[PDB]
Amino acid sequence: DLRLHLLLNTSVTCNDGSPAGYYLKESRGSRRWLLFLEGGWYCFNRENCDSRYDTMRRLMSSRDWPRTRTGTGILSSQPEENPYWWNANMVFIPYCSSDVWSGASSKSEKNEYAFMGALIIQEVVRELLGRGLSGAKVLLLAGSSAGGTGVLLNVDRVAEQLEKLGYPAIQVRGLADSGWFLDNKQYRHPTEAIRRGIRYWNGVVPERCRRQFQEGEEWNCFFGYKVYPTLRSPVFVVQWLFDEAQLTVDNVHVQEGLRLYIQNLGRELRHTLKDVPASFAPACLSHEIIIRSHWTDVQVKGTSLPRALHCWDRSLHPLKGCPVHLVDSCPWPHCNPSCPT
Ligand SMILES: CC(C)COC[C@H](CN(Cc1ccccc1)c1ccccc1)N1CCCC1
Ligand SMILES: *[C@@H]1O[C@H](CO)[C@@H](O)[C@H](O)[C@H]1NC(C)=O
């Protein structure tokens, strides 16, 4: 089990001003550290954040968090469940800021809620340095859904933080699961929600991407295919070709018009990954993968995700029989037989 620690700096808070935190299981024989960002949508104004506080309160407050959590999938310490990194130091960071991990604003006389996602990540890193992270060789910042987008927005800032604190030997990398979206045409009649959220949250984006798009256009940096080329840290992208959250935003819930729409979406997703050399993109209708207990079961071209990640590790020391770029070419959901049921 992973054990809860609330942040010693109690000014870095969840939405309601309660302290943020992290769950930790140390592995003293290992120099690998895995820091996982939880997902769970977001809120973007007073009225919809109040609604979230009523029925999704664990995503806005630490007051009701349990003392422990069980690590699953890539967070499991059992080699049978996690062939990739079972001996690593494991960290699960709960999502309690509702800001896609981008916020840097405190509660105040003008602000009913605090949106501190970007500061929460930085404070977790700083406090872990006193608990063994100072000896790491590799820090993998991973995340699913809003947490996958969170990796893209924060991985280079973690790398810059460790350099400035005097730890240039730690190699920072990212693993972004189910956070690679397209700003496409909907099937029936959403970027406005991110534009509004950034202002409400005092949201921050990576500096090189910010300098490209400029004031008022920072929402562009929330889209993987636009922010990825600006990043310097190595990032492995995991994305279903027919992601259910993508389809929900597109108003898809089969005749010719919908058939063409769905096939075009898979082709467009595949196009955006052509120049992403570490990627895993199966032709399945689903959402999230890395913390599911049966994450080992899916394969692309005969290679599982745990294998592809191991081959990525080797490449950062092409490899014979050890591929890292794995994108399905078949054009319809479940054309890959290994898709989840
Ligand atoms: C997992 C969540 C963070 C996903 O949020 C999806 C979008 C926000 N977009 C905008 C978007 C526009 C077009 C197509 C897809 C998404 C978004 C964009 C990039 C990264 C995160 C969220 N919302 C709009 C209303 C409801 C959800
Ligand atoms: C606590 O965090 C806040 C916000 O990140 C920061 O301004 C402050 O310096 C921190 N306090 C200490 C003692 O580091």
Curated annotation (Swiss-Prot):
Q: Which residues are glycosylated?
A: N9
The record's subcellular locations are: Secreted
Enzyme Commission numbers on file:
3.1.1.98
Query: Per UniProt, which keywords does this protein have?
Result: Glycoprotein, Hydrolase, Phosphoprotein, Secreted, Serine esterase, Signal, Wnt signaling pathway
Q: Which GO terms describe its biological process?
A: bone development; negative regulation of canonical Wnt signaling pathway; negative regulation of Wnt signaling pathway; protein depalmitoleylation; regulation of bone mineralization; Wnt signaling pathway
What catalytic activity is recorded?
[Wnt protein]-O-(9Z)-hexadecenoyl-L-serine + H2O = [Wnt protein]-L-serine + (9Z)-hexadecenoate + H(+)
Q: What induces it?
A: Up-regulated in hepatocellular carcinoma (HCC) with high intracellular beta-catenin.
Tissue specificity, in the record's words, reads: Rarely expressed in adult normal tissues.
Do the record's keywords include Glycoprotein?
yes
Q: Where is the active site?
A: S145 (charge relay system), D243 (charge relay system), H287 (charge relay system)
Disulfide pairs here are none
GO molecular function term, any single one: palmitoleyl hydrolase activity
Q: Give the highest taxon in the source lineage.
A: Eukaryota
- Quick one: where is this thing mainly located? secreted
* A GO-annotated cellular component: endoplasmic reticulum lumen
Provide the family line. Answer: Belongs to the pectinacetylesterase family. Notum subfamily.
Q: What does this protein do?
A: Carboxylesterase that acts as a key negative regulator of the Wnt signaling pathway by specifically mediating depalmitoleoylation of WNT proteins. Serine palmitoleoylation of WNT proteins is required for efficient binding to frizzled receptors.
UniProt protein name: Palmitoleoyl-protein carboxylesterase NOTUM
Organism, by scientific name, is Homo sapiens
